[PDB]
Design a protein around this ligand. Structure first.
Ligand SMILES: CN1CC[C@@H](C(=O)Nc2cncc3ccccc23)c2cc(Cl)ccc21
Ligand SMILES: CN1CC[C@@H](C(=O)Nc2cncc3ccccc23)c2cc(Cl)ccc21
Ligand SMILES: [Cl-]
Ligand SMILES: [Cl-]
Ligand SMILES: [Cl-]
Lengths: 305, 306
């Protein structure tokens, strides 16, 4: 019993975190095989960030301008190249702690664990969701750039996020490990804002199934709904549309609890229109949307890595 | 910016998790140096659990009755002893992944990270607090026994909890790493129940200071309170009493934000009376009590967002 916001075990990623310094700027890098990946803005001074020409700034740097520290060991940079908004520093040593890994780009609503780092040292691990507006509500201070987000499927670490910046509302923006930003953001000190966000409907339904599995049923009702009627209600409360793919993905949880997906949708529709009436679900007075259907099955089944 | 329920990176503990089997029972063990620590109930059958005589059950076991698996490698058990509710299995190999560590017994309200494990393999990491009633609200299934709670301040892992059981309300009970239970619980299947739980007041105040540091002030008010008047109100909402030690502990956060501890107490009294009226504090519609004053200072910036 119990249901917690649970991150993947971070050990496989901790063994990849390094400190990258270029001039006065220090941030985190991800060391996989003989390459260290980090945000390309490590080469910028605060003035450069106003309007940077990254290729021009990079052409002025030599390998010795990048100091990479892995624990208390300096790695030798033997090459440097840029791929989108990520800088790739070739080093003379392959990381002996390199796990089985892949680079994956996730979709909004997908969750991942963030290993927050400062000066190449892991400080904490927390579970995030990629918001529908492509930001993450992370917890990051100055020096956290280069911290990564990941999932684990079996013994393979799928790296999906690298931290780049904080937007004025305190939310965060970053890229996949190929340097492509999530969302319409750019790596420059210019006016940028997170768009209006929406709730991840399939994730709320998954969390309602988790509540039922854990003995909370007060919100269940005798009603069902059509997918079209639910989606009209979802649009009204800034909830993401629920697709037939989402309904299919919720199939296992629906079969385990005996509550059809559209039956759970009728519970959610009532919760939106009426609220919780002083009640809580899994110790929350808000509908939680940062657990995917897979997260719920994994936690409630005890999957290990 | 931002404020998340954040666990310590679990790598240093993952490299210590092993599987311990005794007969038909399999659970997790913590391998540090040449010793594997695990709940002593690994020697019980389900039947033995009502009134087990652990001394009598253990004397009947030899070293070869304990199978310890670290990854795909069987460790050889060369000794066994019981310390309170923990079984200590001496093994012939020191764990090369043993981090700098210590054993610490924590007090209610303290927080820690839990690395939930099954069959010696880590499944997930989450943040917990030792409730005032000495239970923890974990996420644990059958086979999770032996999973540990810890803090990693500096490069030293302080192990503070080992999971032993789930109580009928779905909450969890365990011991420190010396095998002493937290709370009035026993490692028996006898009728046991968690006492009435209460909110960790000092932690709620710490979290209100985190909200102020992150720019949220809507809940502040022009009032202050005496410590005694605060406790008379707070106790009516099943909040733990706030002691002068708690007021002292909140001093740094009080100095950083410019809000005196008793002034923040008056804000808490008003929140208990009014609720949030559709508003949230740090993305929560309830008052959060699983962040200590130490956690807030570690997570938050040294500069308040005035
Ligand atoms: C102007 N500026 C600041 C430094 C860096 C930035 O956002 N860094 C930070 C990241 N995460 C949390 C922070 C919390 C407080 C301060 C900085 C934080 C950055 C990066 C880009 Cl791509 C563009 C601009 C910019
Ligand atoms: C009767 N019984 C059951 C097995 C074990 C126990 O509590 N195991 C479990 C632990 N954590 C979560 C669980 C979730 C579902 C099931 C078991 C769980 C245990 C241990 C002691 Cl010390 C006393 C009694 C007892
Ligand atoms: Cl609601
Ligand atoms: Cl599934
Ligand atoms: Cl303590």
């Amino acid at each position: 019993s119990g249901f917690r916001k649970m991150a993947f075990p971070s050990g496989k990623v901790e063994g990849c975190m390094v400190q990258v310094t270029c001039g006065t700027t220090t941030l985190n890098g991800l060391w996989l095989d003989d390459v260290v990946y980090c945000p390309r803005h490590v080469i910028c001074t605060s003035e450069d960030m106003l309007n940077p020409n990254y290729e021009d700034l990079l052409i002025r740097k030599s390998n010795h301008n990048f100091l990479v520290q892995a624990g208390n060991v300096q790695l030798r940079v033997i090459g440097h190249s840029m791929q989108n908004c990520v800088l790739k520093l070739k080093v003379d040593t392959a990381n002996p702690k390199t796990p089985k890994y892949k680079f994956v780009r996730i979709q909004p609503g997908q969750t991942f664990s963030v290993l927050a780092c400062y000066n190449g040292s892991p400080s904490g691990v927390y579970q995030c969701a990629m918001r529908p507006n492509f930001t993450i509500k992370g917890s990051f201070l100055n020096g956290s750039c280069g911290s990564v987000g990941f999932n684990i499927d079996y013994d393979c670490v799928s790296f999906c996020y690298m931290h780049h910046m904080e937007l004025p509302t305190g939310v965060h923006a970053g890229t996949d490990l190929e340097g492509n930003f999530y969302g319409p953001f750019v790596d420059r000190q210019t006016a940028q804002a997170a768009g209006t966000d929406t709730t991840i409907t399939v994730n709320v339904l998954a969390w309602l199934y988790a509540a039922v599995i854990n003995g909370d049923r007060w919100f269940l009702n005798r009603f069902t709904t059509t997918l079209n009627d639910f989606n009209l209600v979802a649009m009204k409360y800034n909830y993401e549309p629920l697709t037939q793919d989402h309904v299919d993905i919720l199939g296992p949880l629906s079969a385990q609890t005996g509550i059809a997906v559209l039956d759970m949708c009728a519970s959610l529709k009532e919760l939106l229109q009426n609220g919780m009436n002083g009640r809580t679900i899994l110790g929350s007075a808000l509908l939680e949307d940062e657990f995917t259907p897979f997260d719920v099955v994994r936690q409630c089944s005890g999957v290990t890595f």
